[PDB]
């Protein structure tokens, strides 16, 4: 029963399974791509080794040379860096500063490795669902620019004005399900525990790829 085949469960929540580290705060730096990347790596590290450890977004901000540090970046590029670098440091060994600095990677602080990555077929929410169910938390990019998104508190978020072609923010899909009849994705943000619902938002699922949720989705292989 390969990932893209067979019975995917109705709901999944990796927070309940010890796959998800505490919600972080990226601060004034535009590094959600690095927080989304470390989130997906943290999930695979837990699955592979049984240990849950904060990995270093600053390691990615400083060292993934073609990403733009606090100016944006692609999670695919972050996974490729960890593969070619033969590791990524832990948060404790390479702590978050909130601004791009010179690369200070140290193998002594290495906490995970990467064997490559796969991308979800663009716009395909069924493939994203099967990936979350079979692999673990998946990095995704969304339009987070709307006031309705930024001041979300509860419920399943849907806004017809969300622009699936304006992928301005990277987050982590840690599960999916249904709430009062409304299908959703369970999304870990990087705006602190004070944002949304303890740092999380439920985003509409199977509603025409709302906010672009399946347009730039990927996971690392480990
Ligand atoms: O197509 C989607 O995205 C799913 C549905 C689904 C996806 C993947 C594997 C199985 C199912 C499924 C179908 C019918 C009953 C129970 C489960 C959904 O609509 O939630």
Swiss-Prot record:
Catalysed reaction equations from the record: Broad proteolytic activity. With small-molecule substrates and inhibitors, the major determinant of specificity is P2, which is preferably Leu, Met > Phe, and not Arg
Active site positions: 32, 169, 189
Main subcellular location of this protein, as a coarse class: other
EC number: 3.4.22.38
Keyword flag Flavoprotein: no
Protein's membrane topology: Peripheral membrane protein
Domain of life: Eukaryota
Gene Ontology BP annotations: bone resorption; collagen catabolic process; extracellular matrix disassembly; mitophagy; negative regulation of cartilage development; proteolysis; proteolysis involved in protein catabolic process; thyroid hormone generation
GO cellular component, one term: lysosome
Keywords: Cell membrane, Disease variant, Disulfide bond, Glycoprotein, Hydrolase, Lysosome, Membrane, Protease, Secreted, Signal, Thiol protease, Zymogen
Family affiliation: Belongs to the peptidase C1 family.
Involvement in disease: Pycnodysostosis: A rare autosomal recessive bone disorder characterized by deformity of the skull, maxilla and phalanges, osteosclerosis, and fragility of bone.
Name by which UniProt lists this protein: Cathepsin K
Native species: Homo sapiens
Full protein: residues contained: 108 to 329 of 329
């Amino acid at each position: 029963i390969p990932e893209w085949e067979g019975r995917a469960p109705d709901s999944v929540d990796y927070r309940k399974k010890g796959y998800v580290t505490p919600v972080k705060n990226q601060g004034q730096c535009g590094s959600s791509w690095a927080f989304s990347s470390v989130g997906a790596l943290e999930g695979q590290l837990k699955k592979k080794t049984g240990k849950l450890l904060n990995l270093s977004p600053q390691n990615l901000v400083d060292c993934v040379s073609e990403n733009d540090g606090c100016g944006g970046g692609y999670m695919t590029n972050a996974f490729q860096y960890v593969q070619k670098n033969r590791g990524i440091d832990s948060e404790d060994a390479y702590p978050y500063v909130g601004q791009e600095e010179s690369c200070m990677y140290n193998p002594t602080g290495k906490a995970a490795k990467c064997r490559g990555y796969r991308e979800i077929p663009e716009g395909n929410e069924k493939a994203l669902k099967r990936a979350v169910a079979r692999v673990g938390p998946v990095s995704v990019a969304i339009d987070a620019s709307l006031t309705s998104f930024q001041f979300y508190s509860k419920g399943v978020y849907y806004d017809e004005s969300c622009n699936s072609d304006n992928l301005n923010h990277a987050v982590l899909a840690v599960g999916y399900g249904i709430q009062k009849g409304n299908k959703h994705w369970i999304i870990k943000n990087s705006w602190g525990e004070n944002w949304g619902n303890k740092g999380y938002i439920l985003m509409a699922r199977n509603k025409n790829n709302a906010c672009g949720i399946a347009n730039l989705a990927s996971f690392p292989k480990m």
